[PDB]
Amino acid sequence: GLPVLNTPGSNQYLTSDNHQSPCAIPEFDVTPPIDIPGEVKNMMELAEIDTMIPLNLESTKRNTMDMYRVTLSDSADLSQPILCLSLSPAFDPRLSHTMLGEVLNYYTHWAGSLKFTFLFCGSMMATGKILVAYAPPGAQPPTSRKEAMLGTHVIWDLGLQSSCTMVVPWISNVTYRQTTQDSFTEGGYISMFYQTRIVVPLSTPKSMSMLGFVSACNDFSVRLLRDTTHISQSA
Amino acid sequence: GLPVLNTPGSNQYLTSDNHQSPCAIPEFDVTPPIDIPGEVKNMMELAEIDTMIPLNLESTKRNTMDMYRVTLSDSADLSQPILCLSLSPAFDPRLSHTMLGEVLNYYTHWAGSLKFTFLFCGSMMATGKILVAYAPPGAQPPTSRKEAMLGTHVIWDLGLQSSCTMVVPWISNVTYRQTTQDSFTEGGYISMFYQTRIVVPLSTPKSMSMLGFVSACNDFSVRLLRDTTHISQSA
Amino acid sequence: GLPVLNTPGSNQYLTSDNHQSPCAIPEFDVTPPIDIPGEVKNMMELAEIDTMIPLNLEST
Amino acid sequence: ISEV
Amino acid sequence: ISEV
Amino acid sequence: ISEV
Amino acid sequence: ACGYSDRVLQLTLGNSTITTQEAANSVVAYGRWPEFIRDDEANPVDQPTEPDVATCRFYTLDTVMWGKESKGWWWKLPDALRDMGLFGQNMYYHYLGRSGYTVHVQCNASKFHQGALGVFAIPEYCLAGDSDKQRYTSYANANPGERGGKFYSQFNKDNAVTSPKREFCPVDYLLGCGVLLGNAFVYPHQIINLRTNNSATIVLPYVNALAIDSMVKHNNWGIAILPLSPLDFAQDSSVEIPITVTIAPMCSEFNGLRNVTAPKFQ
Amino acid sequence: QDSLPDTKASGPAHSKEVPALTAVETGATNPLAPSDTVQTRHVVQRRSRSESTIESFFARGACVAIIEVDNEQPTTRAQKLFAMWRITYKDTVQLRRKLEFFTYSRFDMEFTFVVTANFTNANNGHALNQVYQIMYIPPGAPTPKSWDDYTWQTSSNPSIFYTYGAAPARISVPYVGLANAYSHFYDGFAKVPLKTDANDQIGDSLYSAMTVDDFGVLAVRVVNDHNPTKVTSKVRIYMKPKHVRVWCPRPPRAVPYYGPGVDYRNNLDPLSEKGLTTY
Amino acid sequence: QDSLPDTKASGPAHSKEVPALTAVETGATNPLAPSDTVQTRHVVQRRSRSESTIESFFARGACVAIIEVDNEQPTTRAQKLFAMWRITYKDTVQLRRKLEFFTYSRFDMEFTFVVTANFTNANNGHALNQVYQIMYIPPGAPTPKSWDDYTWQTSSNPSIFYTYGAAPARISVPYVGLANAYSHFYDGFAKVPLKTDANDQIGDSLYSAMTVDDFGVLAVRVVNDHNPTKVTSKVRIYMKPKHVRVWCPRPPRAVPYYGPGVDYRNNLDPLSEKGLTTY
Amino acid sequence: QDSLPDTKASGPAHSKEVPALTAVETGATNPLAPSDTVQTRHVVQRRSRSESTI
Amino acid sequence: GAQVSSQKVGAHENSSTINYTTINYYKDSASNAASKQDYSQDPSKFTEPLKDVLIKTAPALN
Amino acid sequence: GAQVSSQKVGAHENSSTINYTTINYYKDSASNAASKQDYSQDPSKFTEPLKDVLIKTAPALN
Amino acid sequence: GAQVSSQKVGAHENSSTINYTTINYYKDSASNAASKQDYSQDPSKFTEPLKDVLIKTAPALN
Ligand SMILES: Cc1cc(CCCCCCCOc2ccc(C3=NCCO3)cc2)on1
Ligand SMILES: Cc1cc(CCCCCCCOc2ccc(C3=NCCO3)cc2)on1
Ligand SMILES: *C(=O)CCCCCCCCCCCCC
Ligand SMILES: *C(=O)CCCCCCCCCCCCC
Ligand SMILES: *C(=O)CCCCCCCCCCCCC
The technique by which this structure was obtained is X-ray
User: What Rg do the C-alpha atoms of chain I give, in angstroms?
Assistant: 27
Q: What is the DSSP string of G121-180?
A: EEET----BSSSSTT---HHHH--GGG-EE-BSS------TTS----B--BGGGTTTTS-
CA distance J53 to chain C (A): 4
Ligand nearest to the CA of M2: 5
Residues on E contacting L at a C-beta cutoff of 8 Å:
1-4
Q: How far, in Å, are G48, G57, I39, I52 from residue G13 at the CA level?
A: 21, 5, 49, 42
Is the bond preceding residue I270 a cis peptide, omega within 30 degrees?
A: no
Q: Are H151 and B228 in contact (CB under 8 A)?
A: no
- Tell whether M16 lies on the interface with I, counting CB pairs under 8 A: no
Residue G8: DSSP 8-state: -
Q: List chain H gaps (C–N > 2.5 A) by preceding residue.
A: none
Q: State the pairing for strand pair G149-150/H62-71.
A: unpaired
Residue B199: DSSP 8-state: B
The residue nearest atom 8 of ligand 1, judged by CA position, is H215
Q: How far apart are CA B100 and CA B115, in angstroms?
A: 11
| Spacing, Cα H153 to ligand 1 middle (Å) | 20
Q: How far apart are CA I246 and CA I248, in angstroms?
A: 7
Residue J33's CB: how many other CB atoms inside 10 A? 15
Using alpha carbons, select from A112, A94, A142 the residue that is nearest to residue A223.
Answer: A112
Q: Which of H157, H176, H179 sits opposite B226 (nearest CB)?
A: H157
| Number of domains into which chain H is organized | 1
Residue B18's CB: how many other CB atoms inside 10 A? 21
- Tell whether M7 lies on the interface with K, counting CB pairs under 8 A: yes
Contacts of B107 (CB under 8 A, 6+ apart): B90, B179, B222, B223, B224, B225, B226, I51, I52
Resolution, rounded to a tenth of an Å? 2.9
Ligand nearest to the CA of I138: 2
Strands of A87-219 (E only): list them.
107-111, 114-120, 129-135, 152-157, 163-168, 177-178, 189-194, 207-216
> How many CA atoms are closer than 13 Å to the CA of H251, on its beta-carbon side?
9
Q: Which of B27, B30, B33 sits opposite M36 (nearest CB)?
A: B27
- Burial of residue I34, with CB atoms counted within 10 A of its CB: 0-12 exposed, 13-18 middle, 19 or more buried: buried
Q: Which residues does chain M have within 8 Å of residue B26's beta carbon, measured at their own beta carbons? A: 36
Q: Which residues does chain M have within 8 Å of residue K27's beta carbon, measured at their own beta carbons? A: 5, 7, 20, 36
Q: Which chains touch A (3 or more CB pairs under 8 A)?
A: B, C, H, I, K, L, M
Chains G and J touch (3+ CB pairs under 8 A): yes
Q: How far apart are CA K60 and CA B161, in angstroms?
A: 7
Using alpha carbons, select from G104, G99, G122 the residue that is nearest to residue G35.
Answer: G99
Q: Is the dihedral of CA B18, B21, B23, B24 positive or negative?
A: negative
User: What Rg do the C-alpha atoms of chain F give, in angstroms?
Assistant: 4
Chains D and G touch (3+ CB pairs under 8 A): no
Pocket of ligand 1 (CB under 6 A): A 24; H 87, 89, 109, 111, 134, 136, 158-160, 171, 173, 176, 182, 215, 218
User: Do the chains contact at A167 and H37, CB–CB below 8 Å?
Assistant: yes
Q: Where are the domains of chain A?
A: 1-235
For the domain that residue H115 is a member of, what is the CATH number? 2.60.120.20
Q: What is the DSSP string of chain L?
A: --EEEE----SPP-----EEEE----SSGGG-----------THHHH---SSPPPTTS-S--
| Spacing, Cα H215 to ligand 1 middle (Å) | 6
- Tell whether B27 lies on the interface with M, counting CB pairs under 8 A: yes
Q: Are I248 and B36 in contact (CB under 8 A)?
A: yes
Dihedral pair phi/psi, residue H106, rounded to 5°? -145, 125
Residue A56's CB: how many other CB atoms inside 10 A? 23
Residue C38: DSSP 8-state: S
Q: Are H47 and H4 in contact (CB under 8 A)?
A: yes
Q: How far apart are CA H278 and CA H273, in angstroms?
A: 11
Q: Are A41 and H54 in contact (CB under 8 A)?
A: yes
Q: Which class does domain B1-235 fall in?
A: mainly beta
Q: Which residues does chain M have within 8 Å of residue A3's beta carbon, measured at their own beta carbons? A: 25
Instruction: Provide the CATH number for the domain formed by K1-62 in this structure.
Output: 4.10.80.10
Identity at G55, one-letter amino acid code? T
| Number of domains into which chain G is organized | 1
Q: How far apart are CA B48 and CA B5, in angstroms?
A: 50
Ligand nearest to the CA of A23: 1
Identity at K9, one-letter amino acid code? V
- Burial of residue H49, with CB atoms counted within 10 A of its CB: 0-12 exposed, 13-18 middle, 19 or more buried: buried
Q: How far apart are CA H17 and CA L59, in angstroms?
A: 8
Residue K6's CB: how many other CB atoms inside 10 A? 15
Dihedral pair phi/psi, residue I145, rounded to 5°? -100, -20
- Any bridge partners for residue H221, and if so which? H82, H133
Residue M11's CB: how many other CB atoms inside 10 A? 25
